[PDB]
């Protein structure tokens, strides 16, 4: 019950182009970063509990805790999705997030020339509804440890630092309420073609494999 968690690399060094020197300057952020859907203001469903500078890139762990979100997604995706499966609300939310918001996008501000990066650079993390462009791959799960576990390449140092900062975030236990109607406008994109979804799901599958993240419950 309650919160679910989300993790991923915001960017990969050497492979939006954030260098090491930029990331060092931007962390830790000025204020905790909200999580919204597709950069929609007034559409916060969560918060980033921590961000660390792993050797491969900045890596984040987030909480999502919006009680209306699961029913708006379920309604969007429609009555036949889960078949005969017996599932809790939390589980249903996890399947829906993993198949309809399978990627994210770090919002960083465009800097004027000669303006050095500082800890206000990163504003928030959008979870991206599946569509004509997919962002960076994320993993969802029921606990922080489970959300980060599929990322085997994350250094031991960054993993413990991440889980320990997160365990102390003031945002850990928040709840984000949102209107049925606001969420519905934000999530309307989940109602575009089979063309667009089958093609995007293949892209997402390939990108997850490239990122080393595999599973049988929520991932494939």
Q: Where are the domains of the chain?
A: 1-220
Which top CATH class is 1-220?
alpha beta
Active site residues: 39, 105, 124
Which among 157, 131, 151, 125 is positioned nearest to 139, based on CA atoms? 151
Cβ 155 vs Cβ 55: under 8 Å: yes
Q: How far apart are CA 42 and CA 61, in angstroms?
A: 21
The structure was resolved to a resolution in Å of 2.0
Cβ 119 vs Cβ 27: under 8 Å: yes
Which two tokens mark 118?
């500082």
Own/partner pairs for 113-121, CB < 8 Å, 24+ apart?
116/25, 117/22, 117/25, 117/26, 118/25, 118/26, 118/30, 119/25, 119/26, 119/27, 119/28, 119/29, 119/30, 120/29, 120/30, 121/22, 121/25, 121/26, 121/29
Cβ 137 vs Cβ 47: under 8 Å: no
**Which method, experimentally, gave rise to this model?**
X-ray
Q: How far apart are CA 156 and CA 160, in angstroms?
A: 6
Cβ 86 vs Cβ 105: under 8 Å: no
Q: How far apart are CA 128 and CA 8, in angstroms?
A: 13
Q: Give the angle subtended at the CA of 110 by the CAs of 106 and 112, to the nearest 5°.
A: 155
Q: How far apart are CA 33 and CA 28, in angstroms?
A: 10
Q: At which residue do the structure tokens 């800097």 appear?
A: 111
């Amino acid at each position: 019950m309650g919160p679910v968690y989300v993790s991923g690399y915001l960017a990969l060094y050497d492979r939006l182009a954030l260098t090491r020197e930029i990331v060092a300057a931007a962390l830790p952020p000025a204020g905790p970063l909200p999580i919204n859907i597709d950069h929609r203001p007034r559409c916060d469903i969560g918060a980033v509990l921590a961000v660390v500078d792993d050797d491969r890139g900045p890596f984040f762990l987030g909480v999502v805790n919006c009680p209306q979100l699961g029913a708006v997604l379920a309604r969007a995706v429609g009555p036949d999705f889960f078949g005969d499966m017996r599932l809790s609300d939390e589980e249903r939310l996890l399947y829906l997030l993993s198949n309809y918001l399978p990627s994210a996008s770090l919002s960083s501000r465009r800097l004027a020339p000669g303006e050095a990066p500082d800890e206000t650079l990163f504003a928030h993390v959008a979870l991206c509804v599946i569509g004509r462009r997919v962002g960076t791959i994320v993993v969802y799960d029921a606990s922080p440890e489970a959300a980060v576990a599929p990322f085997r390449q994350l250094s031991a140092r960054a993993r413990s630092e991440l889980l320990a900062r997160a365990a102390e975030s003031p945002d850990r236990e928040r709840v984000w309420h949102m209107s049925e109607e606001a969420l519905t406008r934000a999530l309307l994109s989940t109602a575009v073609n089979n063309m667009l979804l089958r093609d995007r799901w293949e892209l997402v599958a390939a990108r997850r494999r490239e990122a080393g993240v595999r599973g049988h419950t929520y991932l494939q």
